[PDB]
Amino acid sequence: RMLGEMWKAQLNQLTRQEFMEYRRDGIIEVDRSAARKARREGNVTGGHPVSRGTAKLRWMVERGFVKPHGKVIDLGCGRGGWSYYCATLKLVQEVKGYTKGGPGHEEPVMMQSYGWNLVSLKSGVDVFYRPSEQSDTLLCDIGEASPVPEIEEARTVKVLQMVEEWLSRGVEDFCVKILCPYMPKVLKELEKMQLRWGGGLIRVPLSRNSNHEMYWVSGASGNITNSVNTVSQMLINRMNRTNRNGPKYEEDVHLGSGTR
Numbered sequence: 001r002m003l004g005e006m007w008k009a010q011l012n013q014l015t016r017q018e019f020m021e022y023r024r025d026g027i028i029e030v031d032r033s034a035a036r037k038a039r040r041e042g043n044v045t046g047g048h049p050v051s052r053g054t055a056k057l058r059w060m061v062e063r064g065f066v067k068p069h070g071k072v073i074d075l076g077c078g079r080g081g082w083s084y085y086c087a088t089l090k091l092v093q094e095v096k097g098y099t100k101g102g103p104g105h106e107e108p109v110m111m112q113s114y115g116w117n118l119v120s121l122k123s124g125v126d127v128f129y130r131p132s133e134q135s136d137t138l139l140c141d142i143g144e145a146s147p148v149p150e151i152e153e154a155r156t157v158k159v160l161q162m163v164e165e166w167l168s169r170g171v172e173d174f175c176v177k178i179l180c181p182y183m184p185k186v187l188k189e190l191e192k193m194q195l196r197w198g199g200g201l202i203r204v205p206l207s208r209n210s211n212h213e214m215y216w217v218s219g220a221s222g223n224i225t226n227s228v229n230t231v232s233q234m235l236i237n238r239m240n241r242t243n244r245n246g247p248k249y250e251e252d253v254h255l256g257s258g259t260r
């Protein structure tokens with residue numbers, strides 16, 4: 001058994017009060033109070049990201065793990081945090097985002113962040129049955145949590161099988177959420193996809209301790225098993241501390257306004 005399986009089992013055994021004290025202990029968290037207000041007041045020009053996802057992709061882009069450029073396709077775009085962020089980037093020319101929407105799913109939000117006119121978000125799209133398209137940059141942020149690791153395993157494998165089809169359509173840069181990177185079917189599939197397409201797995205420190213999500217990104221490298229175990233050991237070490245401090249707060253991304 002991978003160390004991550006022990007982590008998931010230990011996580012599920014926490015009391016609710018332990019879980020709540022653990023999930024954000026020592027992580028980085030952007031202050032979203034101003035953005036949440038702007039969403040309630042319909043402020044689309046203040047530069048506030050539509051979701052917490054913008055800060056996560058910004059973290060990866062600023063360290064060179066992915067380099068959005070040209071035509072960007074954003075699979076599972078939700079409200080559009082990754083898509084609007086990419087449209088602010090100089091090398092990016094066009095952004096197409098697809099998301100399922102509907103009951104219990106996030107709907108695309110229309111924003112006027114810098115470059116908004118380059119962004120087309122389409123709701124009502126199940127990407128698992130959508131024909132693939134050409135892109136220069138492929139992003140995918142799909143993976144619904146479950147307390148059952150085999151369910152997270154199956155969901156992650158489906159994303160990987162879907163992104164295999166899209167990666168063969170001319171993709172130069174990519175960033176794909178790996179919801180459950182420690183289970184055997186995911187590790188087997190990731191290793192084959194790393195052999196074919198390269199890249200490596202990274203942990204964004206804005207990810208909460210209540211998940212083991214990692215990102216398979218074209219600008220990273222390194223042994224996948226080692227990368228996963230490193231995360232698992234860090235998450236277990238955090239779980240086994242009693243003196244909790246909550247998150248380290250940082251400033252959210254500013255996306256500006258105006259057309260490009």
Ligand SMILES: Nc1nc2c(ncn2[C@@H]2O[C@H](COP(=O)(O)OP(=O)(O)OP(=O)(O)O)[C@@H](O)[C@H]2O)c(=O)[nH]1
Pocket residue numbers: 011012013014015016019023145146147148208210211
């Ligand atoms: N012990 C314990 N584990 C939980 C609890 N809620 C969720 N989990 C575990 O944590 C995983 C992530 O749950 P989430 O609800 O997505 O995590 P979260 O940090 O609470 O994030 P948000 O609910 O979106 O604010 C689940 O798949 C479970 O394995 C809980 O109340 N107690």
Ligand SMILES: Nc1ncnc2c1ncn2[C@@H]1O[C@H](CSCC[C@H](N)C(=O)O)[C@@H](O)[C@H]1O
Pocket residue numbers: 050051052053054075076077078079080081082083098099100101105106125126127128141142143
């Ligand atoms: N089968 C499917 N087809 C298209 N979108 C899906 C999907 N299953 C889940 N999703 C969507 O994928 C999204 C992942 S959340 C993505 C957050 C985004 N990166 C941001 O920054 O705002 C969810 O909104 C979910 O509704």
Ligand SMILES: [Mg+2]
Pocket residue numbers: none
């Ligand atoms: Mg929760």
